[PDB]
């Protein structure tokens, strides 16, 4: 309930994704690596990137050892590949354990490293069954509970408006959340996979059929900004959102997130933006709740510029940075569970907050999974 030592331990900046402090081989070599739950392998810049400050000096560390096998890893707006390998690793502001974990040496990139980050790897926090080559690549936090004492969770608290938030490995600390946790349980054990069983703008329903909202999955993204949508899905919340704003008038282009708009210096008019609800499936049978976002989660700032933060996915629901900053989110991998809390340090105006409300009356929650 209280990990004061691990609080605070993520940085980055808006857009580039959040950051922990990991320390690879020995000696201890620092990197910042991004805290990913989209993805389950743990990779570290291994050769002299230009964008990169830090990097794997692999020649240096005595508790190196090669696992002489390749890992080519393909992805929709990128790629990476390396070299697979093991090495001692510890976290300066975690649990006080070191563990002995796969790490992939990225040896060849494209679209990869960001020009300005301040990271030089991912952590892959999901599970091995998407784990590049094979499910038998065991992920660093499957390393981590087999090895110790740290119980099978994690929290995250990414606070966005540079940026901050708190890692707490195996455990919750209840500083960072008001009021009470309501779990989803996770559907499948790949991506952190959850079930959206009723959406609404400002409380007005969509009315599609629940299984559009999860078409063709619906998973918790770290390594994500953006809340993405299925495009059917998309072009409902996107009718909806321009109808309750029609008080103010924007370019077609905007919510296409081509374009960006302006209000003179704070004086932003965040009370004519509707709220975003998305049910997901409770822990009970016919029982579910509801996490409410502001648009001070969706409308991500660029005379104030913004820009629509809510976009159309082919590859399913993403409940990316614009979900996850407004809520701590606990990852109770032991109880194949999903705990969502309002965040201590979300942005909110004085007349709304983020929310998490139930419990709700849900019939046919199995039939909004897709197969
Ligand atoms: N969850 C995800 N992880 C990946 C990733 C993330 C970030 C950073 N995330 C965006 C930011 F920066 F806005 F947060 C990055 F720069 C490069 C990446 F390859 C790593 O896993 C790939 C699958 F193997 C898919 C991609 C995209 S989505
Ligand atoms: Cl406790
Ligand atoms: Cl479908
Ligand atoms: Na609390
Ligand atoms: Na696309």
């Not at 805290?35 to 560390?61: C, E, I, K, M, W």
Request: charged residues 20%; proline residues 5%.
């Amino acid at each position: 309930g209280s990990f004061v030592e691990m609080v605070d331990n993520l940085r980055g900046k808006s857009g580039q994704g959040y950051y922990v402090e990991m320390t690879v081989g020995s000696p201890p070599q620092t990197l910042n690596i991004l805290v990913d739950t989209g993805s389950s392998n743990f990779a570290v810049g291994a050769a002299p990137h230009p964008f990169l400050h830090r990097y794997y000096q692999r020649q240096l560390s005595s508790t190196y050892r090669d696992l002489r096998k390749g890992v080519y890893v393909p992805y929709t707006q990128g790629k990476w590949e390396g070299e697979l390998g093991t090495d001692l690793v510890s976290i300066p502001h975690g649990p006080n354990v070191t563990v002995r974990a796969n790490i992939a040496a990225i040896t060849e990139s494209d679209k990869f490293f960001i020009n300005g980050s301040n990271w030089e790897g991912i952590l892959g926090l999901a599970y091995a069954e998407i784990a590049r080559p094979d499910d038998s690549l065991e992920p660093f936090f499957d390393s981590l509970v087999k090895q110790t004492h740290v119980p099978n969770l994690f929290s995250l608290q990414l606070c966005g408006a540079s940026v901050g938030g708190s890692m707490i490995i195996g455990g919750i600390d209840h500083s960072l959340y008001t009021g009470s946790l309501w779990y989803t349980p996770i559907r499948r054990e790949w991506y952190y996979e959850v079930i959206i069983v009723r959406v609404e703008i400002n409380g007005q329903d969509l009315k599609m059929d629940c299984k559009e909202y999860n078409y063709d999955k619906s998973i918790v993204d770290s390594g994500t900004t953006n809340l993405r949508l299925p495009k059917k899905v998309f072009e409902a919340a996107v009718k909806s959102i321009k109808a309750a704003s029609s008080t103010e008038k924007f370019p077609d282009g905007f919510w296409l997130g081509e374009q960006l708009v302006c209000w003179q210096a704070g004086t932003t008019p965040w009370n004519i933006f509707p709220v975003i609800s998305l049910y997901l499936m409770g822990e009970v049978t016919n029982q579910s709740f509801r996490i409410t976002i502001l648009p001070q989660q969706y409308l991500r700032p660029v005379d104030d510029c913004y820009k629509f933060a809510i976009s159309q996915s082919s590859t399913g629901t993403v409940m990316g940075a614009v979900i996850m900053e407004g809520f701590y989110v606990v990852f109770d991998r032991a109880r194949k569970r999903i705990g969502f809390a309002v965040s201590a340090c979300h942005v909110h105006d004085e007349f709304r907050t983020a929310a998490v409300e139930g419990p709700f009356v849900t019939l046919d929650m199995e039939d909004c999974g897709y197969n």
